[PDB]
Design a protein around this motif. Structure first.
Motif, PDB file in Angstrom:
ATOM      1  N   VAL C  58       0.864  -1.188   0.000  1.00 13.77           N
ATOM      2  CA  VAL C  58       0.000   0.000   0.000  1.00 13.77           C
ATOM      3  C   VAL C  58       0.891   1.224   0.000  1.00 13.77           C
ATOM      4  N   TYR C  59       0.723   2.143  -0.949  1.00 10.91           N
ATOM      5  CA  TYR C  59       1.555   3.320  -0.992  1.00 10.91           C
ATOM      6  C   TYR C  59       0.865   4.448  -1.775  1.00 10.91           C
ATOM      7  N   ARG C  60       1.063   5.667  -1.301  1.00 14.25           N
ATOM      8  CA  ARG C  60       0.602   6.920  -1.877  1.00 14.25           C
ATOM      9  C   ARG C  60      -0.875   7.267  -1.696  1.00 14.25           C
ATOM     10  N   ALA C  61      -1.683   6.297  -1.285  1.00 13.34           N
ATOM     11  CA  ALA C  61      -3.096   6.466  -1.004  1.00 13.34           C
ATOM     12  C   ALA C  61      -3.486   5.249  -0.178  1.00 13.34           C
ATOM     13  N   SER C  62      -4.573   5.351   0.593  1.00 18.56           N
ATOM     14  CA  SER C  62      -5.117   4.174   1.187  1.00 18.56           C
ATOM     15  C   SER C  62      -5.566   3.163   0.139  1.00 18.56           C
ATOM     16  N   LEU C  63      -5.687   1.885   0.506  1.00 21.41           N
ATOM     17  CA  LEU C  63      -6.125   0.850  -0.386  1.00 21.41           C
ATOM     18  C   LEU C  63      -7.373   0.197   0.158  1.00 21.41           C
ATOM     19  N   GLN C  64      -8.418   0.153  -0.668  1.00 22.80           N
ATOM     20  CA  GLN C  64      -9.611  -0.608  -0.424  1.00 22.80           C
ATOM     21  C   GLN C  64      -9.772  -1.571  -1.581  1.00 22.80           C
ATOM     22  N   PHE C  65      -9.888  -2.863  -1.341  1.00 17.76           N
ATOM     23  CA  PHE C  65     -10.236  -3.775  -2.390  1.00 17.76           C
ATOM     24  C   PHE C  65     -11.271  -4.785  -1.967  1.00 17.76           C
ATOM     25  N   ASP C  66     -12.034  -5.223  -2.971  1.00 21.57           N
ATOM     26  CA  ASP C  66     -12.998  -6.294  -2.851  1.00 21.57           C
ATOM     27  C   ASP C  66     -12.489  -7.518  -3.609  1.00 21.57           C
ATOM     28  N   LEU C  67     -12.559  -8.693  -2.997  1.00 23.73           N
ATOM     29  CA  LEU C  67     -12.513  -9.959  -3.721  1.00 23.73           C
ATOM     30  C   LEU C  67     -13.924 -10.176  -4.218  1.00 23.73           C
ATOM     31  N   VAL C  68     -14.075 -10.339  -5.525  1.00 27.67           N
ATOM     32  CA  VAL C  68     -15.399 -10.426  -6.091  1.00 27.67           C
ATOM     33  C   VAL C  68     -15.626 -11.712  -6.860  1.00 27.67           C
ATOM     34  N   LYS C  69     -16.862 -12.186  -6.810  1.00 28.08           N
ATOM     35  CA  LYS C  69     -17.331 -13.331  -7.572  1.00 28.08           C
ATOM     36  C   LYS C  69     -18.412 -12.806  -8.526  1.00 28.08           C
ATOM     37  N   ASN C  70     -18.112 -12.809  -9.812  1.00 34.08           N
ATOM     38  CA  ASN C  70     -19.049 -12.311 -10.847  1.00 34.08           C
ATOM     39  C   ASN C  70     -19.490 -10.876 -10.603  1.00 34.08           C
ATOM     40  N   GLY C  71     -18.702 -10.091  -9.902  1.00 34.19           N
ATOM     41  CA  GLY C  71     -19.037  -8.690  -9.616  1.00 34.19           C
ATOM     42  C   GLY C  71     -19.543  -8.439  -8.196  1.00 34.19           C
ATOM     43  N   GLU C  72     -19.918  -9.491  -7.504  1.00 36.18           N
ATOM     44  CA  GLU C  72     -20.410  -9.371  -6.147  1.00 36.18           C
ATOM     45  C   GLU C  72     -19.242  -9.466  -5.165  1.00 36.18           C
ATOM     46  N   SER C  73     -19.162  -8.572  -4.192  1.00 38.67           N
ATOM     47  CA  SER C  73     -18.140  -8.701  -3.121  1.00 38.67           C
ATOM     48  C   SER C  73     -18.328  -9.930  -2.251  1.00 38.67           C
ATOM     49  N   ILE C  74     -17.317 -10.773  -2.262  1.00 38.28           N
ATOM     50  CA  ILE C  74     -17.178 -11.906  -1.308  1.00 38.28           C
ATOM     51  C   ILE C  74     -16.718 -11.313   0.027  1.00 38.28           C
ATOM     52  N   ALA C  75     -15.712 -10.454  -0.025  1.00 37.01           N
ATOM     53  CA  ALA C  75     -15.119  -9.869   1.171  1.00 37.01           C
ATOM     54  C   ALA C  75     -14.353  -8.621   0.763  1.00 37.01           C
ATOM     55  N   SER C  76     -14.324  -7.652   1.652  1.00 35.06           N
ATOM     56  CA  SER C  76     -13.742  -6.333   1.410  1.00 35.06           C
ATOM     57  C   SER C  76     -12.665  -6.034   2.437  1.00 35.06           C
ATOM     58  N   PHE C  78      -9.342  -3.106   3.732  1.00 30.77           N
ATOM     59  CA  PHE C  78      -8.898  -1.736   3.754  1.00 30.77           C
ATOM     60  C   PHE C  78      -7.680  -1.535   4.613  1.00 30.77           C
ATOM     61  N   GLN C  79      -6.754  -0.685   4.157  1.00 30.25           N
ATOM     62  CA  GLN C  79      -5.661  -0.223   4.959  1.00 30.25           C
ATOM     63  C   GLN C  79      -5.453   1.269   4.775  1.00 30.25           C
ATOM     64  N   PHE C  80      -5.471   2.020   5.874  1.00 34.59           N
ATOM     65  CA  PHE C  80      -5.180   3.435   5.945  1.00 34.59           C
ATOM     66  C   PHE C  80      -3.757   3.713   5.530  1.00 34.59           C
ATOM     67  N   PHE C  81      -3.516   4.720   4.688  1.00 33.09           N
ATOM     68  CA  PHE C  81      -2.168   5.147   4.360  1.00 33.09           C
ATOM     69  C   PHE C  81      -1.981   6.583   4.883  1.00 33.09           C
ATOM     70  N   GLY C  82      -1.389   6.703   6.074  1.00 35.80           N
ATOM     71  CA  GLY C  82      -1.346   7.927   6.791  1.00 35.80           C
ATOM     72  C   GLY C  82      -0.219   8.877   6.459  1.00 35.80           C
ATOM     73  N   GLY C  83       0.067   9.117   5.177  1.00 37.15           N
ATOM     74  CA  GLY C  83       1.044  10.123   4.852  1.00 37.15           C
ATOM     75  C   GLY C  83       2.463   9.704   5.195  1.00 37.15           C
ATOM     76  N   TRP C  84       2.747   8.409   5.099  1.00 33.55           N
ATOM     77  CA  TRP C  84       4.073   7.854   5.429  1.00 33.55           C
ATOM     78  C   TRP C  84       5.030   7.892   4.229  1.00 33.55           C
ATOM     79  N   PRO C  85       6.358   7.864   4.486  1.00 36.74           N
ATOM     80  CA  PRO C  85       7.310   8.007   3.382  1.00 36.74           C
ATOM     81  C   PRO C  85       7.556   6.700   2.620  1.00 36.74           C
ATOM     82  N   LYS C  86       7.076   5.564   3.136  1.00 32.53           N
ATOM     83  CA  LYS C  86       7.329   4.263   2.568  1.00 32.53           C
ATOM     84  C   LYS C  86       6.082   3.415   2.711  1.00 32.53           C
TER      85      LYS C  86
END
Lengths: 137, 137, 137
Positions: C58-76, C78-86
């Protein structure tokens, strides 16, 4: 032989208790019924070696959890929650040998590190499956 | 065919070296002896496709690790450790085809990002298992 | 039956789009061709229960992703990206039952949380495999 499950945490405003298994009551797949969505426990019916994984969202407090076999910690995990406005994350996993009637679940091991979370776009999942059987007479 | 293992890191005050495999010397399960708790390496005896996963606690320094096959990086992972008072976390995983005598282990790839950790309520685990065999004559 | 794959994200200066599957075009293993490195999608050919895992940097922005089955979220996840250098890190995983022609992929679900990353010593991986088959006539 076959044994697999996966489940997710429900949204709740209640701070998670740390004196019982963590609940994952939204079942994704549980075709053998080896996982119990009411108790949060997997109960083995096939002797063998299993993989378990927890993929958690962390919010409002740090999260410490143990993957446990019959109450004993298999492995323990932790993620610091440093006063951020949005969630962090924590995964843990391990393999273990089980025999029939053995139980595996997830539980907070340090009783204030209760920050497991779910929301409209975040989840915490608990999954496990038999990798190979090892029956004996 | 069967092949699986899982192991955990021991507690230590020694900063982790970055010129050798990372050690996971507390064995959870290793019924084939394909993992070597002394060297930190898994050695394949069954051709096929495997899943490997590392679930690490990060503390006192950032952590960079490579999952490696015979010294080559399969996949690399990193977690920033931003001067926090308690640990963060880092997981990584991948699949790979192996043949007999191939070896897989975990190693720090950037030699100061050595923050892998274990303590009374935190662990770092390394696990792997055969998903399917593919023998040939 | 057999079905497994694992792939990694390529390095890119382009902010990741959030209106299509996330690409993982560097294939580690895909012996059945069930994963398509051009589209980012796994397409089932064997009915059964599968495990999927994403291990992301995860870098430069927070990341949100869904694992999807045919377009439907199986599970979602998220990780906050708090303005860190790495970079930070985010893993997610779940099990699901699939039937032939069902598709599974990873996609950003909240369209500005696009911080998935890869670099010389960091990766983001997507893996999945059949745990057991369940054919019927």
């Amino acid at each position: 032989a076959r044994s697999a499950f996966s489940a997710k945490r429900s949204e709740s405003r209640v701070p998670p208790p740390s004196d019982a298994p963590l609940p994952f009551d939204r079942v994704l797949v549980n075709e053998q019924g080896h996982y119990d969505a009411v108790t949060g426990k997997f109960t083995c019916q096939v002797p063998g070696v299993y993989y378990f994984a927890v993929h958690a969202t962390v919010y409002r407090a740090s999260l410490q959890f143990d993957l446990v076999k019959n109450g004993e910690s298999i492995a323990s995990f932790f993620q610091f929650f440093g006063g951020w406005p949005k969630p962090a994350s924590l995964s843990g996993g391990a393999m273990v040998r089980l025999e029939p009637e053995d139980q595996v679940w997830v539980q907070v091991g340090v009783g204030d590190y209760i920050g497991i979370y779910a929301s409209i776009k975040t989840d915490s999942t608990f999954s496990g499956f038999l990798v190979y059987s090892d029956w004996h007479s």
